[PDB]
């Protein structure tokens, strides 16, 4: 059982990570549209926050695999 | 806007910057008297063609980091 | 089209890095348009050799499958050197499909390779018969004809 | 058990593939470019190390390579790596490495799809090798002075170059050389 | 001093080096080669127009720092 809720946990992480990629791409587009100056940096900064999320998710993901034997 | 031109003596390559629209006279003398040598002592080449006076770099399709040889006589 | 894009970048790399004294550009055809498959080049002679002061023309004709097959290189009509053909052709080892040609060979590598053979004629593989007779018969006057062809080519 | 064993490794691959995608995305979309990314890689490195560690018991990967190169790729994408690693008193170290050029030798254009060879390590653009290995099934490596013969089957998608190229295109998006102090502005 | 800084390029990429003046250039050539993914005999090296010999150390050639070695393709004519 524990093995399983772990497994379904991982897949949740994977899909979380993917939608975060999309988001980033999407806002990296909103920025390659380059849009006087404020929102550009603002958007760009949210992006930074999202990469954090990414590095942290990988973090969970990894230690999470200590429990599949 | 404004490009960068490497001018090679043979050993040393004193390296310059000009508006794309500037007659290459200016660069020629800039180099010349950075060398102390006087102008008609020198021959400036590009694609093996003697560069003449009024020719702007815009003419010759130059770019960032192109090389201009400088010979004597 | 890739052959052509190759040459186009090749040209601008040349313009950014090429040995001092040498030159290379493609030719205009009867249109006024650029023939990126045909090139004019000049190879200066190494100072202190009888080839010094000489700046010698070669043309480079690139095939349609460049860089799969390498280009043919031609000195003028009847150039005087033991390894130039009477047709003006030269065949360097790196310039050889059947030998050592590869698509990574720089134009700069080619001009340099030629000018090295100018005062390093490999006598094991003569390609002309006046030039080679005199190179083994008497360099005395061979050197003389070398100097006239040397001086010849400073336009 | 065999199925379970293989199945597990499936999960680990996706994990590594997941690290790959994050790293890629990390560089392919950054704004400030100093030593703030050092903490980035740090987390990522440790995470990887941890992950790899667990796998070791459980049931090489390029990701590791990528990770041990990335700090350098940062400071300068064209770096050669002091890959020679000081065996005691190696007194001829390959220090500062230097500069490599980021243009495919065949296409003579910059890289849009690096494809590293495995008999040697020669990186050529996909379009280059594909055009070169057209017709002929095996040819000499298109790099000069390389003797290993090579077919289309010998190439893997190179991540190292993709970075070095992504870095480099970013590391000019803003400014390449700027107002070079050595660029006498002729008035 | 005792070590020197040599630059070793081949017309595309270049590699800086630190070398005891007394290290025979065998190990440098080998290094550049095995490093480039190129074969030894299919190369010639030039310090200031001298075809360098393998076991000839940097102060035999009175090298200095920031000097250059060129690696060309060993070729021939006919
Ligand atoms: Zn190879």
Numbering used by the authors:
A (entry chain B): 329 to 363, 740 to 773
B (entry chain E): 22 to 94
C (entry chain C): 3 to 157
D (entry chain A): 23 to 81, 140 to 267
E (entry chain D): 21 to 98
Paper text:
Here, we present the crystal structure of the Smc5/Nse2 E3 ligase in complex with an E2-SUMOD thioester mimetic at 3.3 Å resolution (SUMOD refers to donor SUMO), which sheds light on the SUMO E3 ligase activity of Nse2 by revealing the atomic details of this multiple interface enzyme-substrate complex. To gain insights into the mechanism of SUMO E3 ligases, we have reconstituted the complex between yeast Smc5/Nse2 with an E2-SUMO thioester mimetic, which contains a stable peptide bond between E2 and SUMO, instead of the labile natural thioester bond. The asymmetric unit contained one complex composed by Smc5/Nse2short, E2-SUMOD thioester mimetic, and SUMOB attached to the E2 backside. The structure unveils an extended interaction between the charged E2-SUMOD and the SP-RING domain of Nse2, including direct contacts with both E2 and SUMOD. In addition to the SP-RING interaction, SUMOD also forms an extended interface with a large loop of Nse2 (named Loop SIM1), which suffers a major conformational change forming a β-like interaction with SUMOD, reminiscent of a SIM-like conformation. Nse2 SIM1 adopts a SIM-like β conformation in contact with SUMOD, forming an extended antiparallel β-strand with several main chain hydrogen bonds. Strikingly, the C-terminal tail of Nse2 can be observed in the electron density maps forming a second SIM-like interaction (named SIM2) with SUMOB, which is tethered to the Ubc9 backside. SIM2 interacts with SUMOB in a canonical SIM-like conformation, burying the hydrophobic side chains of Ile264 and Val266 (positions 1 and 3 in SIM2) in a SUMO surface cavity formed between the α-helix and the β-sheet. SUMOB binds Ubc9 like other reported E2-SUMO structures, through an interface enriched with electrostatic interactions: Asp68 engaged with Arg13 and Arg17 from the 1-helix of Ubc9; and Glu90 with His20 and the main chain oxygen of Gly23 from Ubc9. Thus, Nse2 clamps the SUMOB-E2-SUMOD substrate complex utilizing two SIM-like motifs, each one binding either the donor SUMOD or the backside SUMOB, respectively.
Smc5/6 is a nuclear multi-subunit complex that participates in the recombinational DNA repair processes and is required in the maintenance of chromosome integrity. Nse2 is a subunit of the Smc5/6 complex that possesses SUMO E3 ligase activity by the presence of a SP-RING domain that activates the E2~SUMO thioester for discharge on the substrate. Nse2 is a unique component of the Smc5/6 complex that binds the middle region of the coiled-coil Arm of Smc5 and possesses SUMO E3 ligase activity, moreover, the SUMOylation activity has been involved in DNA damage repair processes. However, the SUMO transfer from E2 to the substrate can be enhanced by the action of E3 ligases, which facilitate substrate binding while increasing the catalytic rate for the E2~SUMO discharge on the substrate.
